[PDB]
Symmetry: C3
Subunit: 244 residues, 3 copies
């Protein structure tokens, strides 16, 4: 029989986002929360949602297979330390857009290293669709994606160093250099442009998109999101929940 | 002159769907009805819509070039017998999603045979986009589609036997095995996965998608639907209405 | 450093459309105006919007890098003459859909010549998605587009002569002949079918799509629009504003 029907929820996931962000980043979080809610129709998993990460010390995080951060990262020492302990003890992460933002004022070296080394460098403006290219066509995140496709509008970040420079990072999707020169207000002219990657030392994926209220208009990118979430969940060292 | 402008409506079509179905299947029917209404702007055809197939014995069906079943099939003996006579006398059908659902309690062998032999076997859950592949790139349904593309979210059915096992069936679109393992709650791991086909003994096409309120977000799948409808309509043994 | 961040708005653009048009052409204009408004978040450029082109003699047009005509062309002699002088003195144009419509009753030979020679010939009906093909994969308008893709629904125009017959026209995107026979009410069976082009004697692009309230459902076509606008703006003989 080719199908494994769940008898009970398979794993637990936590969504964290903030309402204290530019409007477009709140809009994305709201819609992405709907996206994940719909993935949990029929209670395939346990999904908890919060705007307040202060209530989640490590002891209350450890039960989660994955934390999905839609728009921001922890900003207080206690929250940051809880997240670090979680990730260092085999926790899962799916991060979007400004959840990875960091700069000279972040003062969180653990997180810069968790991301693969990249500090924010530059971005195009305004948000626009772009041609994207799959770096590894065999990977579970991208095996059922077209090798290249146009992703819907976002503003896109470069980092320094590029995450690709880290041999422990696998870049999975990149913005094509065919997009250059990229931008109308703020124009990006050259450089490496990874947009989805994983630091292989952690059970984590980062996706650079997540801006505004039209990110779910295309099946292709929607499938990338499903795949990203599924991959991180499947890799739990305690057992692949999809085999239960 | 390369264009044939209609002087009058070209053919008649009937949409049948039910409101007595899970919410997502009612939503799809409603949106698909809008899709077809828009195709009939300017009265290219006569479009009648019903939620009550009991009012349509064979004598009242025979005038229709095609019946579009958006979410369900006839459930009473009288309705089933009217539909059988219609299809056996050269009628047209475009069916979606659970319009083909059948199982050990259906007790309608004519319809299982009409579909090509397949009884419901399994499905993934939750609805998600998937990579789909065109089986015959030359066919009128698929000649202007990309050879592979991502279709928007649905839950997808396997059947036993596969409709492909029937030599009288032409499979037109299939879910790629690159999608395996497919599912988060209910996981499909292997098997043939046709999703659009025609039993060549009838003027009919079946499309497995049709779930929820976001099935029309992509041009590509929208074009598949146009093409499916146009093909069945064009094949009327009484004459191709598009030549009038 | 690979990015050029604007210090001030880079150029000025004018949108003109009419509310005195079929509903679908007003809907497109409204949504396209939103699209351009969003491109101007953060004041990358100066964007002025009007439904009344009578207020724009040549002296008041000359300051604009580009005029975007979403649904119609000037109909009075004074408006037509202002637009002619503007375009003959290095002005920019991005036109959509019925902004290029012209027939035996237009009586504006300058404009027929500006467009590349084509008078309206025929169209399919109803609006539907179609397979489109990039004619020049290296051009700034199309270099980051897939070589072929399905565009969302519009009704599509043929012209006589084809704009392609003019050696001064570069055709950039064409409706594939794989779409033939095209139409349900009004059926197009053959012929050249360019849909995006530029008369190289002017700083102008024409895009045939622009019908209804669902033209922005796909990233790919959205990217074509961004690229079309950016290309015309970049070519200003007074200097590429993106270098400032
Ligand atoms: Cl803690
Ligand atoms: Cl977009
Ligand atoms: Cl997976
Ligand atoms: Cl009957
Ligand atoms: Cl989807
Ligand atoms: Cl056809
Ligand atoms: Cl003037
Ligand atoms: Cl469409
Ligand atoms: Cl450009
Ligand atoms: Zn606040
Ligand atoms: Zn500091
Ligand atoms: Zn510090
Ligand atoms: Zn491969
Ligand atoms: Zn490849
Ligand atoms: Zn290492
Ligand atoms: Zn953003
Ligand atoms: Zn009921
Ligand atoms: Zn029984
Ligand atoms: Zn029985
Ligand atoms: Zn071929
Ligand atoms: Zn092929
Ligand atoms: Zn046979
Ligand atoms: Zn369903
Ligand atoms: Zn779309
Ligand atoms: Zn009026
Ligand atoms: Zn006249
Ligand atoms: Zn005249
Ligand atoms: Zn090339
Ligand atoms: Zn090529
Ligand atoms: Zn010349
Ligand atoms: Zn139109």
């Amino acid at each position: 029989y080719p199908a494994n029907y769940a008898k009970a929820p398979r794993f637990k996931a936590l969504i964290y986002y903030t309402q204290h962000a530019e409007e477009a980043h709140v809009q994305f979080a709201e819609q992405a929360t709907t996206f994940f809610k719909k993935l949990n129709y029929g209670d395939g998993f346990v999904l908890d949602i919060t705007t307040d990460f202060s209530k989640y010390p490590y002891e209350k995080l450890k039960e989660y297979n994955v934390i999905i951060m839609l728009n921001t990262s922890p900003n207080t020492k206690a929250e940051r330390d809880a997240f670090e302990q979680y990730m260092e003890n085999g926790g899962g992460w799916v991060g979007f857009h400004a959840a990875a933002y960091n700069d000279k004022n972040t003062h969180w070296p653990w997180f810069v290293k968790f991301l693969g080394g990249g500090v924010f460098y530059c971005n195009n403006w305004p948000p626009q669709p772009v041609l994207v290219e799959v770096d590894n066509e065999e990977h579970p995140v991208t095996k059922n994606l077209p090798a290249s496709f146009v992703a819907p509008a976002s503003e896109w970040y470069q980092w320094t160093p590029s995450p690709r420079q880290n041999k422990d990072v696998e870049v999975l999707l990149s913005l094509s250099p065919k997009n250059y020169p990229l931008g109308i207000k703020d124009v990006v002219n050259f450089g490496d442009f990874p947009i989805v990657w994983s630091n292989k030392n952690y059970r984590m994926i980062y996706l650079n998109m997540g801006h505004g209220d039209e990110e779910f208009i295309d099946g292709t990118q929607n499938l990338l999101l499903v795949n990203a979430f599924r991959w991180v969940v499947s890799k739990d060292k305690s057992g692949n929940p999809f085999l239960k």
